[PDB]
Design an enzyme around this catalytic site. Structure first.
Site, PDB file in Angstrom:
ATOM      1  N   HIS A 105     -54.617  38.257  -9.333  1.00 55.40           N
ATOM      2  CA  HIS A 105     -55.815  39.108  -8.543  1.00 55.40           C
ATOM      3  C   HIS A 105     -55.152  40.579  -8.215  1.00 55.40           C
ATOM      4  O   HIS A 105     -53.959  40.749  -7.615  1.00 55.40           O
ATOM      5  CB  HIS A 105     -56.178  38.477  -7.328  1.00 55.40           C
ATOM      6  CG  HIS A 105     -57.069  37.381  -7.556  1.00 55.40           C
ATOM      7  ND1 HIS A 105     -56.688  36.057  -7.885  1.00 55.40           N
ATOM      8  CD2 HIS A 105     -58.431  37.482  -7.415  1.00 55.40           C
ATOM      9  CE1 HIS A 105     -57.810  35.312  -8.021  1.00 55.40           C
ATOM     10  NE2 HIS A 105     -58.898  36.056  -7.591  1.00 55.40           N
ATOM     11  N   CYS A 150     -57.605  43.401 -11.321  1.00 52.92           N
ATOM     12  CA  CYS A 150     -58.344  44.696 -10.957  1.00 52.92           C
ATOM     13  C   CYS A 150     -57.776  45.803 -10.391  1.00 52.92           C
ATOM     14  O   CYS A 150     -56.502  45.745  -9.604  1.00 52.92           O
ATOM     15  CB  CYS A 150     -59.253  44.257  -9.589  1.00 52.92           C
ATOM     16  SG  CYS A 150     -60.467  42.701 -10.179  1.00 52.92           S
TER      17      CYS A 150
END
Ligand SMILES: O=P(O)(O)O[C@H]1[C@H](OP(=O)(O)O)[C@@H](OP(=O)(O)O)[C@H](OP(=O)(O)O)[C@@H](OP(=O)(O)O)[C@H]1OP(=O)(O)O
Length: 251
Positions: A105, A150
């Site tokens: 993440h 991301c």
């Protein structure tokens, strides 16, 4: 509510009987798919990505720590076999490229400090352990370290202040030292400017400005870059970046 400590163990029959049949072009690489975090989103992404190209891929659930191992498809496709962490089967030892994807993440916003909550130093140290291990199996000419997660790159900062730029400077000498046929101009870091996910068929989608998740082909039509390459240019000893898929975009 996300449990990053769920640590769902790989279900080999899930891959063989469901995901490979649902989700499965000779790539010239061994793809090491490294699940860093123990949440089920990471787990499903790892399974799905593997299952799209199972013959040349390896799963490592690095979140399992002492119990981490390499999982991969048998030569005959009927079984998921196992080796020690980051080792590969005999049939893959003559590939001339390594792609190593770290599934992580990123944050809700661009950041330069952490990937999957790991500093540059931390991830560099894991990469050092990885390199010392894969050299027992393979001697490639090209390496890509792919940060799948991301908001890890922006063209608004100098490439050397970004996380992938810092990571490349930190690891490049270890790469060339351990993998003697890899030169500096054959190492790349892959990173995302936008939010990305792996869909249920094992394909990467990017979150467009419209709020629509779009696949590879749609991103290209939309003039949206889903992946940047960060690399070191020996000609002027500078870090640089360019878009993988969008012909005009570069540092
Ligand atoms: O070979 P790579 O440089 O690592 O890039 C691959 C490749 O994309 P392209 O060759 O079109 O650039 C795959 O395409 P194929 O080899 O399968 O034709 C694509 O997988 P898809 O077939 O599903 O599009 C995959 O994308 P994905 O992240 O979804 O696995 C993408 O890897 P990158 O997304 O890291 O660029």
């Amino acid at each position: 509510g996300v449990d990053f400590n769920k640590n769902t163990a790989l279900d080999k029959n899930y891959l063989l009987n469901n995901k490979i049949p649902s989700n499965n072009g000779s790539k010239n690489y061994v793809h090491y798919i490294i699940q860093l975090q123990g949440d089920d989103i990471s787990y499903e992404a790892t399974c799905n990505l593997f299952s799209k190209n199972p013959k040349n891929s390896i799963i490592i659930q690095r979140n399992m720590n002492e119990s981490a191992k390499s999982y991969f498809l048998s030569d005959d496709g009927e079984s998921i076999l196992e080796l020690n962490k980051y080792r590969i089967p005999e049939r893959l030892k003559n590939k001339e490229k390594v792609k190593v994807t770290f599934i992580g993440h990123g944050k809700d916003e661009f950041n330069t400090s952490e990937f999957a909550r790991l500093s540059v130093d931390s991830l560099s140290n894991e990469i050092s352990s990885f390199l010392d291990t894969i050299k027992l199996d393979i001697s490639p000419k090209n390496v890509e370290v792919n940060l799948l997660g991301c908001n890890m790159f922006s063209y608004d900062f100098n490439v050397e202040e970004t996380y992938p730029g810092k990571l490349l400077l930190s690891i490049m000498d270890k790469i060339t030292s351990t993998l003697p046929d890899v030169n500096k101009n054959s190492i790349t870091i892959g990173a995302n400017q936008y939010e990305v996910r792996i869909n249920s068929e094992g394909r990467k989608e990017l979150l467009a400005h419209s709020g629509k998740w779009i696949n590879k082909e749609e991103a290209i039509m939309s003039d949206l870059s889903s992946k940047e390459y960060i690399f070191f240019d020996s000609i002027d000893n500078k870090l640089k970046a360019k878009s993988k898929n969008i012909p005009g975009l570069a540092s």
